[PDB]
Design a binder for these strands. Structure first.
Ligand code: MG
Ligand code: MG
Ligand code: MG
Ligand code: MG
Ligand code: MG
Ligand code: MG
Ligand code: MG
Ligand code: MG
Ligand code: MG
Ligand code: MG
Ligand code: MG
Ligand code: MG
Ligand code: MG
Ligand code: MG
Ligand code: MG
Ligand code: MG
Ligand code: MG
Ligand code: MG
Ligand code: MG
Ligand code: MG
Ligand code: MG
Ligand code: MG
Ligand code: MG
Ligand code: MG
Lengths: 45, 55, 146
RNA sequence: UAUAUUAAUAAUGUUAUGAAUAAUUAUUAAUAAUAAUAAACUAAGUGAACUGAAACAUCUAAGUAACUUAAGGAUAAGAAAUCAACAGAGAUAUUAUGAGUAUUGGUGAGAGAAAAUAAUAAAGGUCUAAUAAGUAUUAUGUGAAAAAAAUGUAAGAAAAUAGGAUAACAAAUUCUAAGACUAAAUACUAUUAAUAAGUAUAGUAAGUACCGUAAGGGAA
RNA sequence: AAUUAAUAUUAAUUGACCCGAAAGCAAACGAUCUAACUAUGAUAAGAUGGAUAAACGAUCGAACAGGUUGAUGUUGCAAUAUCAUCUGAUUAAUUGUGGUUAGUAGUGAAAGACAAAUCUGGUUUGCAGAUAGCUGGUUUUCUAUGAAAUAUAUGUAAGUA
RNA sequence: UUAAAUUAAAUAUAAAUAUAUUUAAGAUGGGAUAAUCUAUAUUAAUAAUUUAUCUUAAA
RNA sequence: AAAAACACCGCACUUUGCAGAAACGAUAAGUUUAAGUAUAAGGUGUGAACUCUGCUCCAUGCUUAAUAUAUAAAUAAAAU
RNA sequence: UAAUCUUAUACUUAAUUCUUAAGUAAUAUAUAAUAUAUAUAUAUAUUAUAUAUUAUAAGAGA
């Protein structure tokens, strides 16, 4: 039985999608800049 | 090329005897550039001459 | 020839100082290269390429079927004597450059040739080498006391 | 661990022998401190494909999108090794005409100059090179659908009594490569002022609610 | 007799009357689902048979893990469930926590199986108004005239001259 | 395992970057003592894969 | 769709002498192979064991040997 | 084979550390002279002059 694909764990989620993860890599930086340009309020977890 | 190999020389005064190459010290010879660069010139064993003031 | 991928490089013009938010810890040992370091074929920055770069063109068949290809310069790693430094200096060397060196009589001569073209077709490493050589020469000429 | 450490001193308590050693407080001196920084515009590197050709592979889209790098208030270009035609002009930039002409293309799809004359423009000329080779040139492989200038690989010149420019040669013209600087017209942003046969579903909310793990999408 | 402008028609190029693919390529995002590997932990009642007290991809059998057959369910309790039945159950076992590998592309005891409800190759942004000889749609009124479905050619026969 | 981090010239590469090597980070693991309760600081010197605990022997 | 399909233990063929072979690497350095070294490692078929595995290199490959034999780029100098 | 490639591992002076220059000592190599031993050749010792302080070893090798 599918449907329950997101299996929350705070550690994994901060480590993968978190602000610090984004800011550490060049690709991540691009993403953050993109979100800033769009004016998103929340740049990442 | 072959022609280039045959004919292209560089003029140098050797500052040391080189038995193998038959270039005795002090003498001014026209040698192949490879020879100059890879053997002679190392350790001030020779010196290029572009003109008579280089001598 | 043209030195289009050298003389087109531009570097942030320094503001002269009669402080900045971030100053470097070390001291600039070498003089700034006019044209800076190449961000194009960075393989070239390690040695003496004579302003030759990778070309990109088309492989073409008997059916005129285009397909991208690159062209590399004939680089050779080569330890060559420097009278002024009193040691052999090994570097990457386009064979053309080697030939030029041979013609001109020594690596020092090659480095220390005045023309702007020569300056252009040195790398940053080349520039550094030149600086070393000329400084050394100066030292030799002119001890502290006359 | 700058309510830092080191040094110097000053008051203080302890120990061993007025001098020596450690602890705390207080003054003076010395010694480092903190990349939040745009976006578009410009230049450069790499560089698709869908598509068009009523199929498709040459060609096309297109040196466009995209990614990457670097600079500046702008950037690039720029004072002829240029154009022209035996008469001449006189830096670039890009608008009218020239001209959809010359040129060119599986001579298909299609692509397409320059001279010249006008505008726009600013004072537009002016030395910062002891005047330029592995350079010009050649061979070969690439290279702005038309006009080269570039470039990988090897061969490789000449002194103004000389070079470059045209399939080729002969005349004749013209310019001087391998050294350089350059405002103005221009691009994009932001502000102000004006004009709207513009917008109230292009009239300020919100990049919020919400949707997705995420990039991302996205209301009323 | 031209030429210039306005107005109208037709024609070429640009998305060119409007809507609509499957696709291709570029750059990104995802391995909290899932696969394999990897590091570290944890679980496997009890009984039996073996040439060992302790050696077996051994036997019976709970937990755990499967998913054989049937019934129900099919806008369900549920975008795969329930009940019964059936299989493995010390291992090529199951499982927690973290990590690695994926978009010409990984993992795969291989089923084109899985890579976040499903892939003979994801998703998002862009090229982008791709292209569509195909389908559908194209909004007031009144007047005048009013066809064709034949021939020829066509990679042409749903088209076009 | 990860890290625009670290060796005229670490090595390689159109750019992006990739690589080995150091340094740092990284739990799911390891980490003194202690109810007859216990002191981690500063200075000076020179472990374990699994599994069984039988038989014998003694009293 | 749980099977007669994959895997398997075993059997066979083969490549590679380690500065290897295989794989990955706009391709490179370099990694896995392996702190391994032919009784190993990669690939391929078949698929425990028992009785067994006949005949055939025409063709497509591989593989060894030569001589037979053509051609591509790359050169002097010299002839119309 | 000093083509290419592979692998392993002291003082003095001048501008606390760094760099230059001079000489002297230390070690190595090359050349020259003298003394001794052996069969014109080889070995050892002494003296003079020159050069060096990326290396060494191993391997492939035009
Ligand atoms: Mg969901
Ligand atoms: Mg990751
Ligand atoms: Mg570009
Ligand atoms: Mg400028
Ligand atoms: Mg300029
Ligand atoms: Mg065009
Ligand atoms: Mg000039
Ligand atoms: Mg949600
Ligand atoms: Mg990713
Ligand atoms: Mg049991
Ligand atoms: Mg069992
Ligand atoms: Mg059974
Ligand atoms: Mg049972
Ligand atoms: Mg299953
Ligand atoms: Mg796991
Ligand atoms: Mg099938
Ligand atoms: Mg499977
Ligand atoms: Mg009628
Ligand atoms: Mg049709
Ligand atoms: Mg740590
Ligand atoms: Mg089933
Ligand atoms: Mg068998
Ligand atoms: Mg085998
Ligand atoms: Mg089979």
């Amino acid at each position: 039985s599918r449907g329950n694909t997101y299996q929350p764990s705070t550690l994994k989620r901060k480590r993968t999608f978190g602000f610090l993860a984004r800011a550490k890599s060049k690709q991540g930086s691009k993403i953050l800049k993109r979100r800033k340009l769009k004016g998103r309020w929340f740049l990442s977890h | 090329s072959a022609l280039t190999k045959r004919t292209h020389r560089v003029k140098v005064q050797v500052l040391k005897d080189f038995p193998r190459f038959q270039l005795y010290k002090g003498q001014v010879a026209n040698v192949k550039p490879s020879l100059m660069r890879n053997y002679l010139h190392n350790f001030n064993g020779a010196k290029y001459i572009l003109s008579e003031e280089h001598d | 020839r043209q030195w289009r991928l050298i003389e087109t490089r531009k570097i942030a013009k320094q503001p002269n100082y009669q402080k900045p938010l971030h100053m470097p810890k070390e001291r600039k040992k070498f003089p700034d290269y006019k044209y800076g370091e190449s961000n194009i074929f960075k393989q070239s920055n390690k040695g003496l390429y004579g302003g030759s770069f990778v070309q990109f063109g088309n492989n073409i068949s008997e059916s005129k079927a285009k397909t991208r290809k690159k062209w590399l310069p004939n680089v050779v790693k080569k330890g060559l004597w420097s009278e002024t430094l009193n040691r052999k200096i090994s570097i990457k060397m386009t064979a053309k450059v080697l030939k030029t060196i041979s013609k001109e009589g020594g690596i020092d001569n090659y480095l220390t040739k005045e023309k702007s073209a020569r300056i252009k077709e040195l790398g940053p490493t080349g520039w550094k080498l030149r600086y070393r050589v000329l400084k050394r020469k100066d030292e030799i000429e002119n001890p502290p006391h006359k």
